[PDB]
Design a protein around this ligand. Structure first.
Ligand SMILES: *Cc1c(COP(=O)(O)O)cnc(C)c1O
Ligand SMILES: *Cc1c(COP(=O)(O)O)cnc(C)c1O
Lengths: 402, 401
């Protein structure tokens, strides 16, 4: 099974080199299905980077971003926690040998049978943001350790009037009093700034708001210790607001509002940060049209918006096709997926040299919210993932296991 | 009602005087005093037979080739195969599904104009000869991978697919140069079509390409009028209004004495109304503005309601029991189960106050729902319970023999 198969990445070779080699090796055949190269060493590099940038914050990987068994196994060996939102995610993480104390069930709105599943498997820490959730916990998981999820503002959200998750400060006070009345233990506060964050000061506001709810907790009689700063950190350098600019703003706020001597335990829920850059997708041009307007091209490829490029609809993705000479002419071009749906278009207009059927197009930074939400609509199967890892990366993972 | 092994090939009897709504009520009543309240579908295979009877009456000159991509349920494909439909397959996996149920390749049209070479080869390897195309590069691929194929030229309608009339002339000349046989013309007006006159113009364009093919020496006989027909009565432009415009155009441009064989590629028409989805309210918030409610249910935009993003769907939540005129309604939103702020299924609707454990129903959920669902965030696909009455089974027997 390719899911637990890992290939060696030789010294002085990058994931890009491996991609080029596989492409060369299938040159004279029609075995040209789309495929990923997934560098597990990149995930270890992200972990070293996290330990350096956020030394007080324990990462809990957001499984939904990419539930690859190889990814979860690599991060588990590294010693991360996991943010699970469903029975299936908890099952996946536990099947790889992760104990329940390394899981946070950070779904604020949980089906009762899934709350019971968590209780049956010893997963004690869950989030909530509503009184109905407290009633369900009192019935189905009364000894749970609850983390209150507070609202964060996103001034760029498409729907700012209706926010799916997060209690206001006023509601937070009423929730803490209600939890006390029901004899439910609230142990902390969580927030999630969201992947659309343009200003790191949003984290400062959320940390300040979390401190306010910690103070409310102390007033109601709770022993709050757990601060969860959520996710939304970028997974590549191809962004305006880079990881270390965010962390450089977070750390002074953590020191100010949650000093280490308070006994607080700080965690986060990064998803895309760990995995986005680790996956590169290669698709093959399977069909081609020339349209005179002067010369323009339509390229059809063997992954699309029902597959990996669902990220265009669900994840606000803007994808950048890359070629697998400076003087050669570029033409206005559109790129289409393989399904028989006129909506299955990946790129409306870009400039490309004339390409041909059998040529490859590459898409970097395809690890997060891609394969996790792909379907087999129209019968088109998911691209094979080839996992690679260098010897030195494997050795680094071994050091973490000890 | 519980499935017996795998849901795929399990079918339950629908007793005399019971409807799919009654079965849905019974299942809801059966789990009432428990927490096993996962979302589920009731799929009435007898509704697919009713659609088939309606098609034979409305379009008696047109052989239906079911568009598998709309809903690739094995139970649906087996029902329609026994009924004697053809199948429109776009990929190796869809061809494999149809052949696995015993359908011979002559009842398959590979109506994907832009096909991966290895998938063209798969079709050739399995005797699927009829394929569509709309480009010169496609002719080059067919010349190499499926040289004895019978090609159907897909034309543009009022743009991912479809050759203009000007391009169609060049493609016919090119096909002749490459010794590839072109046997007909196809078009697809699109599900978004509000004007049935689009079909008249498409049929006139198809006649023009037939005439162009006759000029270059082809024996054109296959007219394929595509899909886009509605699957429920909950539409402005109803099936029989469309067919009432199509039939006079077929008789005018393609009279029966010409030897033409006319087919179509209905997907949603056959299956939309056959599936009703029941979702459970798993979480609830009250928001004071004056009281409004937010309901969370256990299927969402990554599951069955992907139709909101991919299929232009406008979904209508229904209660098990039609409320009293006196009952107070509140402004309400409905959200899916995933930890994604975008997973919202209804922005604003009026509902009585509802509670965790209550069910909401969504009718007409057969087409472009389960076919494109994912298990994002670990949320599993709803169980489908297939039902069929004895009289529906008898009707299927009449079609099968
Ligand atoms: C999805 C999710 C995350 C991960 O988000 P990223 O943008 O991938 O970092 C973190 N926390 C919660 C509660 C989530 O639902
Ligand atoms: C999808 C498709 C159909 C089916 O469309 P419906 O709107 O479901 O009837 C028919 N023909 C072609 C070529 C298609 O791609």
């Amino acid at each position: 099974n390719e899911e637990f198969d890992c290939h060696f990445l030789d010294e002085g070779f990058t994931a890009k080199d491996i991609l080029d080699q596989k492409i060369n090796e299938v040159s004279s055949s029609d075995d040209k299905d789309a495929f990923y190269v997934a560098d597990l060493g990149d995930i270890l590099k992200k972990h070293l980077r996290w330990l350096k940038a956020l030394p007080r914050v324990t990462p809990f990987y957001a499984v939904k971003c990419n539930d690859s068994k190889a990814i979860v196994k690599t991060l588990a060996a590294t010693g991360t926690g996991f943010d699970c939102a469903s029975k299936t995610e908890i099952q996946l993480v536990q099947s790889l040998g992760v104990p329940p104390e390394r899981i946070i069930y950070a779904n604020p709105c949980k089906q009762v049978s899934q709350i019971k599943y968590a209780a049956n498997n010893g997963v004690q820490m869950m989030t909530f943001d509503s009184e109905v959730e407290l009633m369900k916990v009192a019935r189905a998981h009364p000894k749970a350790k609850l983390v209150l999820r507070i609202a964060t503002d996103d001034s760029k959200a498409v729907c700012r009037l209706s926010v799916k998750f997060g209690a206001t400060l006023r509601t937070s006070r009423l929730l803490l009093e209600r939890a006390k009345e029901l004899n439910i233990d609230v142990v902390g506060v969580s927030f999630h700034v969201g992947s659309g964050c343009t200003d790191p000061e949003t984290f400062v506001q959320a940390i300040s708001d979390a401190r306010c709810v910690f103070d409310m907790g102390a007033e109601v009689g709770f022993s709050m210790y757990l601060l969860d700063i959520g996710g939304g950190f970028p997974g590549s350098e191809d962004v305006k607001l880079k990881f270390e600019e965010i962390t450089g703003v977070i750390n002074p706020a953590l020191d100010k509002y949650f000093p280490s001597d308070s006994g607080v335990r700080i965690i986060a829920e990064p998803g895309r940060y760990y995995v986005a850059s680790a996956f590169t997708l290669a698709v093959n041009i399977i069909a081609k049209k020339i349209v005179l307007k002067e010369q323009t091209f339509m390229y059809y490829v063997n992954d699309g918006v029902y597959g990996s490029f669902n990220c265009i609809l669900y994840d606000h993705a803007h994808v950048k096709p890359l070629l697998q000479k400076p003087d050669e002419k570029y033409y206005s071009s559109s790129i289409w997926g393989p399904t028989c749906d006129g909506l299955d278009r990946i790129v409306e207009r870009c400039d490309l040299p004339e390409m041909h059927v059998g040529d490859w197009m590459l898409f970097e930074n395809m690890g997060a919210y891609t394969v996790a939400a792909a379907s087999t609509f129209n019968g088109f199967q998911r691209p094979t993932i080839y996992y690679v890892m260098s010897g030195p990366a494997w050795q680094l993972m071994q050091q973490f296991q000890n």
